[model samples]
Target chain A: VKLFRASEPILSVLMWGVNHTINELSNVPVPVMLMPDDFKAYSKIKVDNHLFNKENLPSRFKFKEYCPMVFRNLRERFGIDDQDYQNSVTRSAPINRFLTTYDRRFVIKTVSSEDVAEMHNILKKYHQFIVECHGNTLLPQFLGMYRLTVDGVETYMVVTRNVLSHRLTVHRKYDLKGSAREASDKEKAKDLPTFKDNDFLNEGKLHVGEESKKNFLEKLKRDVEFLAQLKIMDYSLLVGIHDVDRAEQFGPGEFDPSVDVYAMKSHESSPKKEVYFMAIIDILTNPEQYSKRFNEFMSNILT
Target chain B: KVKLFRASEPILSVLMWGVNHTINELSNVPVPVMLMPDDFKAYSKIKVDNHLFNKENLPSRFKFKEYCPMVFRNLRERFGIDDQDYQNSVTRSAPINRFLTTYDRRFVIKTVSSEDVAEMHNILKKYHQFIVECHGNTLLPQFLGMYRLTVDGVETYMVVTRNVLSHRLTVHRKYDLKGSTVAREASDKEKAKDLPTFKDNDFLNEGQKLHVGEESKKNFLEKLKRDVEFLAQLKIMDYSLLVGIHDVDRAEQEEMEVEERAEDGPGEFDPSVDVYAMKSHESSPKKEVYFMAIIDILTPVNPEQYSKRFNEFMSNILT
Candidate 1:
């Protein structure tokens, strides 16, 4: 649609897509499969599915269309230290599928030409972008693209208040210790997901039947409810997560198994370590219409 | 049937069993005295006029900055308690901001009784007898009463309808207690409605259909004739034991009292229920409802005439 130097059809297609975009999210969802070139197929389309929208699809598109985007930056899959969060920074076949599986999903800021209007003509849409920056805390904090806007020149910045902790801990500890640090100090860590003050890495195993454990379970439930918002978030990154049971849970109060975020454990007086959750937001994907797919999910469907 | 609560029994004792259990559960239930979730400011869409309030007067209740002690004054006056003792009870009570209101921040009117015949005689005005006294018989309620709690701080909405389900339905001007509302009924709602037992003391002899089955909101308004005249004749009913009662005719003296309850929002539509469920989950309303009672009945406002006039008003307003 873009490459064509056509005029009338462009407006026709854009409006047709944008107007019916959110309403059609339940239908025609294009799930991603392999990275570098997402050829994922969908299984079990919903009653309102919109997969075969002939009028909207273009030959090329970006990935930030959905308000909550899943950018398959290599820096995300490997540690930030592993690469520069860009393909050119470090090119490797292993890192190609940044958002590798359907379990990981990315959403782009969703807006329409009409949202920002003054006299009901010539409007600008999108003011801010909401990032599912990390997996465990990826559950919806009600962050939105309702505010997504250009951060600056070349730097598309989105402001997000940390529903858990604002700065995600890009901890680079070894695997076991990585798990340990995640369970101990994830959100509270200033820079990297460091060890909590008390031994920092170990949760000393899940609490037993003690009342304190019961309390954690309650907290866990709230945390789970919050993470369910990212239900679709996981689906986008997973290879074949199509069933509604497996769609990326990213909106609000949805679910995403790829991020399994089932619990959050913390000392009463201290910052919590988001636990009992596994994450995979970094699965790689070099999608052709990444932005288109993102805009597809930003319709606030869960409402 | 009257579920006569033993007024003689000590309420604290009755509540202790549940309180201790809850206390125990809370003790173990990570009453995490502290949880530092990374701060995230909300209202991502501040540009949008978030509420219809600035636009439409949907008649939803909102909090009018009321002093808490005023609550005690109201309670004392309605229940016929002495102002001093009532003042003392309320004075010792904690700040109202501390009390969590269950009735989504609005005052609802509950009809304790309505002596329509007596009222008509008093004012030489006329009204129809309602068999709305379905919840009980001979409601010689000690007095008309109500208690208000700040609705979520300010959404103190007046629910013209009953609130029975969850927070999903907060107002009945639109309706909250409806057994069949998406807000009230999640597709997965398995809990059978614990509907409050409705009394039909006045409908004993006559077959009084309260909610017209085939009725529409328009038709319902048609049935509520006194409402229009009441609103026109009287200002919003604000009554206290010591309200101004000029020594005009004895009839006007009694008429104001009737207007008192009337303005308090009488009929099921006029009033709302105020339930308090904060410190705990079970609903705790001060357990009060207010309305006028009929004491006399001669040739009265014919039900048919009333219905016709009401319907005309209804259609005029609606159409």
Candidate 2:
């Protein structure tokens, strides 16, 4: 070993700076992210389908012009680049649950203007179901929302910070995959389901199938739920009513033999991911509208 | 005693060079022990890996002290990790850990890009805090912009970082402070976590002595402006500003002695932390400004009060 000078004084000053710096990262907000590949696919889905080539194609399409919803407008400040910026954007996850820079980073699944009418129709019908049910189900509490925009043309995307304690359906898919025949929390995907794909989905359930993976996501679920809970208390803000719902139509004890409701392919399972979910993002609306829309969607799925 | 280190191995050097050190007397240190790791080189390897996460090593920018154009030049002369390799492997190592000191820590700039934001965010996160630099020299941050004025009317620059300091001057400062905070755990117990809220609000609030930091800050700020202007005008040789909300050592002393004083509140407000000793650029590089620093702090509020108070401060500062 080479002998060296040990000037402890110099080390002390450097150490002070280093320590002060590490603790700071905890305060930075954890961002939600979309895998670059998936995000690119989601953004390009329209253009690739020749949808961008419509007879009334927008002349000299600017990115901001493609914004489709109000909530996405929040992202307008990000100045996303032309080569599918949203798909590649990500922020670090918070160290602990409480003190991140943002509530959470999010990568919302893509749904464009082309599908807005159908999607809204689906949402309206679902809202109808919730209205009939008196909004009893656990559902997301919608906050005001925005979409990305440049010119008048809207991009089919929205932005939101994830709320806590919300039961995510992403892991529920794993629960079904983990079981054999009988069930505790989730119904097995194979051997048939007691619930119909459209069965009183007030408490919604994804279609389960033989191909589902056992959810090792229990840990991730716990962490997410933990964070959601902390988010509410940290802000003294109401925890958005996490429309935490699971497939209830499938009887608790048995997988129904008569019905054959196949679970759709897992968006994350493939090398090429495909994410899909109907979400009520913020709008140029009031909190009441946010609350009303969120609750309505969950209630509809529950029935 | 040197036994304060909690990590399995000591990665950081044993002492800092710039700060004055009162070396402990031989009698002050108790006893020395012999260890199984016979070779000091082996001990260094362990220390290097532990602090750096060498097993699954994530590359970080080299530390700023090590990267100052002057410092890098010295390192080049010494042949420490050759120039090209250091450029590739070491650039982000230091800066990344520096940024993690806080969440809303940000930078001020004349312009911005998505890559710039992403890169800054990544470096900050490695050490665990967050960064939020404002891009655009063209646009001065509004009140909502996190910029504030001293009673004298000097503007406080806004940056997002987690280090414990109350304020930092440069874009890379936040991370340097965070590294210092981590190194302090052996010496100070309170350094375990990042500061709780907008540190300045708490300090100003404390100075004002209100039940709520928010209320205290309102009063404190009102009074602070008057006091800062008074000091600036009086031109005292040894006056002081609250340098940190969490610690006293980071405070500046004997630094603000100006023969010429401002005309008090009657004149324009000036930057408080940036007091200068002389305007001559010949002898000292940073002639006009005496000190430009980042303040790291500790959190004190209950969980429920934190976010609400922080958000409120953001709103208040901005509006």
Provide the DockQ value for model 1: 0.01
Cα displacement (Å) at residue B294, model 2: 36
Each candidate's iRMS in angstroms? Answer: 23.6, 26.0
lDDT per residue (tens digit) for residues B267-319 in model 1: 12321222211111112222111122211122223344433443352233221
Docking verdict class for candidate 1: incorrect
lDDT of 1 at B49: 16
Report the CAPRI category for model 2.
Answer: incorrect
Clashes of each: 99, 141
- TM (B chain), model 2: 0.19
**Residue-level error in angstroms, candidate 1, position A270:** 36
Per-residue alpha-carbon lDDT of candidate 2 for residues B100-186, written as tens digits (9 for 90 to 100): 221122221111233433332233221111111211100111111111111122222222221222223321111111111112212
Q: In model 2, how large is the Cα lDDT of residue A261?
A: 14
